[PDB]
Homo-oligomer: A and B are copies of this chain.
Amino acid sequence: EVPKPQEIRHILSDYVIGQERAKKALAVAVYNHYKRINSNETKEDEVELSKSNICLIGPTGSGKTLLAQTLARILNVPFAIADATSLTEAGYVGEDVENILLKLIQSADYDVEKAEKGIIYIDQIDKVARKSDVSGEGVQQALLKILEGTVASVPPHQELIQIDTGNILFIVGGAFDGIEQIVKNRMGEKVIGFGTDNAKLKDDETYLSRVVPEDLLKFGLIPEFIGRLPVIATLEQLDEAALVSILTEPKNALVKQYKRMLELDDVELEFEPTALIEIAKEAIERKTGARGLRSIIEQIMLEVMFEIPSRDDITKCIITEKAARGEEEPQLQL
Q: Is the CB of A294 within 8 A of B42?
A: no
Asked if A13 is an interface residue, CB under 8 A from chain B, the answer is no
Chain A 13-57, CB within 8 Å of chain B: the 1/0 string? 001000001001101100110011001001111111111100000
Q: Is the CB of A306 within 8 A of B9?
A: yes
CA distance A223 to B85 in the complex (A): 12
In the complex formed, the residue of B with least CB distance to A25 is B302
CA distance A89 to B137 in the complex (A): 9
Q: Is the CB of A295 within 8 A of B90?
A: no
Q: Assembly of this chain: how many copies?
A: 6
Q: Is the CB of B288 within 8 A of A96?
A: no
Chain A 80-115, CB within 8 Å of chain B: the 1/0 string? 011101111111111110010001001100000000
Could you say which interface size class chain A belongs to?
Answer: 35 or more
Contacts A35-B264, A86-B155, A232-B299: A47 and B256 contacting too (C-beta < 8 A)? yes
In the complex formed, the residue of B with least CB distance to A217 is B288
A243, chain B: closest CB distance, angstroms: 12
A263, chain B: closest CB distance, angstroms: 7
Asked if A144 is an interface residue, CB under 8 A from chain B, the answer is yes
Contacts A60-B227, A106-B153, A226-B295: A251 and B48 contacting too (C-beta < 8 A)? yes
Chain A 225-258, CB within 8 Å of chain B: the 1/0 string? 0111111100000000000000000011110111
Within 8 Å CB of A52, what residues of B?
294, 298
Q: Is the CB of B27 within 8 A of A306?
A: yes
CA distance A36 to B261 in the complex (A): 8
Contacts A91-B91, A295-B230: A46 and B260 contacting too (C-beta < 8 A)? yes
Q: Is the CB of A45 within 8 A of B93?
A: no
Asked if A65 is an interface residue, CB under 8 A from chain B, the answer is yes
Known contacts A223-B289, A230-B297, then 5 further A-B pairs from the complex at CB < 8 Å, ordered by chain A residue: A39-B264, A43-B256, A83-B145, A85-B135, A103-B153
